[PDB]
């Protein structure tokens, strides 16, 4: 009856803005970036190892200071790493040994994480007692949570396993805002740098454009066939690059509200676990799980070196704040970093 | 050339490593579990009779099962989170004839997944005393559910236990090679599947798995030294 | 709450023999870096023992080697001084003070209450030039202190610390490496200066910040104090 009739609007809107996204694409990227010089060889080698966890390594976070960096690893262990001259800060063990994700605060106090206990604790590093306590634990989440990523002191965006992202207000610790839309697991998110609208990767082939102060969903991009399971915004906020289980990774770009190029070599079969660009947004870095990391000429698409180095998958993969490095986290234990 | 503050602060960081390898000898030695199985199994009654995690001792080995279940149907995408478990013990309600061929299809779909491509299961049919009243009573077939019973019958290398009509050895024999058939078909030599009958009273089962995670080391480490 | 309270004082005749006890609550003991500082009846401060965390390094002053020995007690707590061969120069207050040391943290944060223990070279001399300014409530003063040998290590820290000690209390961190704030003082507190030239800078001095204020350094052991600036109303 009515439903018949509900689902054909649906249908003719999707026909609507498939032809106004045909109309509004000339030319490719492709097709402009052709007369600029490539790159050329990038050789990066690791300049530091840190041989501290004892299991898998899941997820990593630089400080915002560029020299720390806390990596969280599946025998239920936060290390605090000093990256410059390799110590150790902290090490934080975990009340449940499950983690999937890892967060340093932009402010250096505070340390988020999370897992298959569906709750987020945040940790506070900076006491007046020299350990370091639980300051919270956020549980309001229906399924497994894949991401953290701080805002500031008082506000975290979290990306849960039930189709789900929230908003929470640390203080409280009640959930401000749900952002509810996807049809599937919510793997990984990335934040702007103005931290006013973010971005959100789900297993139903599709990232979503989220508006933190209004709550609702701006704009939807599906260009995958597969899970996607890493994605990072380039650095101006206008573009994002999102990774996926069947080999290739893209560049979507929010003004022209579509594709714009399909990063992927024919001897390239295994998925993407992490994504992230360089300081000028011409490095797409992919770490694969054929052990190795790729690093993308993302303007021209073509491939510009490798970084190989680690005996099992990459699973984490960050770019500090001034750009001077790469730290590569994988499956054997180690972190690794590499300029 | 260091100072005096960083001086201490590679001691601080020596004492943080001296702790973590304290913990890497403590859990170098514990055997992990991954508990999997339908909703009217019984996997919890299992675990109380001997809530996510749960750590016992037999012989002075700690065991460390976990039954991650608070989670919705789809298992496809927490699963690469164990690939490095000791085993899978999975539990089958093996009394229920119209809600076993899902239990069939989710083994086939946990045998042949892409990270368990080593992890061995330890196969529990659980609650065997309701089998053996639904058999006797002669109320509900099992050729209704499963065709090819009409042309299964006992073979000569089984070991029925005392006190019990062939019939329910017969119906038993038959869920046990439904499952192994969809062990042996695929995976030949990586893992195996070791099939237990159990009840629900029981209370041997952690002799059971302390033998069978004895058994699955001891392939790993013949595996390992170049030695098979 | 996080206190340190140290007792075995009182009257000893020289030549003898006395144990100094520092017991601590509210905090992680087993993880603190613990030194023992003591004070004369009139002068200044100067640094006497160090014991790391895990007792896996221990210090001494160079006029009191081999005649003391510190340890701690882990589990029960607590921080011992055993003190013999006393002469009549060790008459004196002393103060237990913690410290922790990893990257940016904030070392002699908390100072204990202090014994008064009545007895009947290659180092660095922080000198201050000033010993006493009279200050008016509301004004900008200023405060020197030169030292010696250089403070800039070649990783950019500048090891000198700042410290306030009023009268009647115990001393408390000002400003931890010429720069940084402590955690709990008012921003009107500030250092600058480099390499060999270090100055206090206060802005709307209220009557609360009259006292005696202390330049550490903390290049190389032993660490070695400043004279003290009075700061009379």
């Known amino acids: 009856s009515e439903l018949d009739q509900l689902r054909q609007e649906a249908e003719q809107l999707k026909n609507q803005i498939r032809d106004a996204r045909k109309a509004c694409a000339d030319a490719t990227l492709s097709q402009i970036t052709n007369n600029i010089d490539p790159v050329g060889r990038i050789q990066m080698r690791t300049r530091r190892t840190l041989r501290g966890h004892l299991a898998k390594i899941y997820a990593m976070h630089w400080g915002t200071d560029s020299r720390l960096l806390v990596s969280a690893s599946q025998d239920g262990k936060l290390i605090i790493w000093d990256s410059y001259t390799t110590n150790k800060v902290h090490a934080i063990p975990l009340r449940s040994s499950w983690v999937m994700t890892c967060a340093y605060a932009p402010s250096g106090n505070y340390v988020a994480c999370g897992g298959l206990d569906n709750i987020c604790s945040i940790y506070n590093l900076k006491t007046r007692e020299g350990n370091v306590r639980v300051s919270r634990e956020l549980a309001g989440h229906t399924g497994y949570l894949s991401c953290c990523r701080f805002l500031d002191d008082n506000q975290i965006v979290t990306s849960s396993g039930d189709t789900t992202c929230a908003l929470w207000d640390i203080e409280t610790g009640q959930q401000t805002t749900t952002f509810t839309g996807h049809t599937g697991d919510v793997m990984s998110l990335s934040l702007a740098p103005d931290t006013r609208l973010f971005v959100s990767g789900a297993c139903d082939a599709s990232a979503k454009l989220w508006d933190v102060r209004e709550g609702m969903c701006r704009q939807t991009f599906t260009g995958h066939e597969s899970d996607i399971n890493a994605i990072c915004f380039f650095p101006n906020g206008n573009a994002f690059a999102t990774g996926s289980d069947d080999a290739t990774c893209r560049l979507f770009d929010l003004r022209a509200d579509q594709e714009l190029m399909t990063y992927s070599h024919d001897n390239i079969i295994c998925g993407i676990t992490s994504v992230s660009f360089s300081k000028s947004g011409r490095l797409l870095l992919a770490g694969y799980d054929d052990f190795n990391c790729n690093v993308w000429d993302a303007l021209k698409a073509d491939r510009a070196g490798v970084l190989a180095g680690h005996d099992n998958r990459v699973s984490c993969l960050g770019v500090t704040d001034d750009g001077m490095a790469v730290a590569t986290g994988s499956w054997d234990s180690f972190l690794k970093i590499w300029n | 050339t260091l100072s005096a503050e960083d001086k201490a602060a590679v001691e601080r960081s020596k004492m943080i490593e001296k702790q973590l390898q304290k913990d890497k000898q403590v859990y170098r030695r514990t055997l992990r579990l991954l508990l999997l199985g339908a909703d009217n199994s019984g996997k919890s009654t299992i675990v109380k009779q001997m809530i996510f995690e749960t750590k016992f001792q037999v012989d002075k080995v700690n065991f460390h099962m976990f039954d991650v279940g608070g989670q919705r149907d789809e298992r496809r995408k927490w699963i690469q989170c164990f690939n490095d478990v000791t085993a899978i013990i999975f539990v089958v309600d093996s009394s229920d004839y119209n809600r076993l061929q899902e239990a069939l299809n989710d083994f086939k779909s946990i045998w042949n997944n892409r990270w368990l491509r080593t992890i061995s299961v330890i196969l529990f049919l659980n609650k065997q005393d309701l089998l053996a009243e639904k058999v006797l009573a002669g109320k509900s077939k099992i050729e209704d559910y499963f065709p090819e019973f009409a042309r299964y019958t006992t073979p000569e290398d089984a070991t029925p236990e005392p006190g019990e009509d062939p019939r329910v050895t017969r119906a038993k024999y038959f869920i046990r090679k439904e499952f192994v058939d969809i062990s042996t078909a695929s995976g030949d030599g990586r893992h195996i599947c070791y099939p237990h009958f159990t009840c629900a009273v029981d209370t041997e089962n952690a002799r059971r798995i302390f033998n069978d995670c004895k058994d699955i080391i001891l392939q790993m480490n013949l595996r390992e030294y170049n030695l098979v | 709450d996080v206190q340190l309270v140290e007792s075995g004082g009182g009257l000893v005749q020289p030549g003898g023999s006395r144990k100094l006890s520092c017991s601590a609550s509210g905090f992680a003991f087993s993880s603190f870096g613990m030194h023992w500082v003591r004070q004369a009846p009139e002068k200044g401060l100067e640094w006497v023992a160090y014991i790391s965390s895990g007792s896996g390094t221990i210090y001494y002053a160079d006029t009191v080697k081999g005649r003391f020995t510190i340890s701690r007690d882990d589990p029960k707590n607590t921080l011992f001084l055993q003190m013999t061969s006393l002469r009549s120069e060790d008459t004196a207050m002393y103060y237990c003070?913690?410290?922790?040391?990893?990257?940016?943290?904030?070392?002699?944060?908390?100072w204990g209450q202090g014994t008064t223990l009545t007895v009947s070279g290659s180092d660095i001399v922080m000198t201050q030039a000033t010993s006493s300014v009279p200050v008016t409530p509301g004004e900008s003063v200023s405060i020197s202190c030169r030292s010696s040998?250089?403070?800039?290590?070649?990783?950019?820290?500048?090891?000198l610390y700042w410290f306030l000690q009023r009268p009647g209390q115990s001393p408390q961190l000002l400003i931890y490496?010429?720069?940084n704030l402590a955690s709990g003082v008012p921003d009107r507190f500030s250092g600058s200066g480099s390499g060999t030239a270090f100055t206090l800078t206060i802005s709307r001095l209220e009557a609360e910040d009259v006292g005696v204020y202390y330049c550490?350094?903390?290049?190389?052991?032993?660490?070695?104090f400043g004279a003290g600036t009075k700061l009379e109303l």
């Open positions: 003070v913690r410290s922790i040391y990893y990257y940016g943290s904030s070392p002699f944060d908390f």
């Open positions: 550490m350094q903390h290049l190389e052991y032993p660490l070695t």
């Open positions: 490496r010429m720069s």
């Open positions: 040998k250089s403070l800039l290590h070649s990783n950019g820290n500048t090891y």
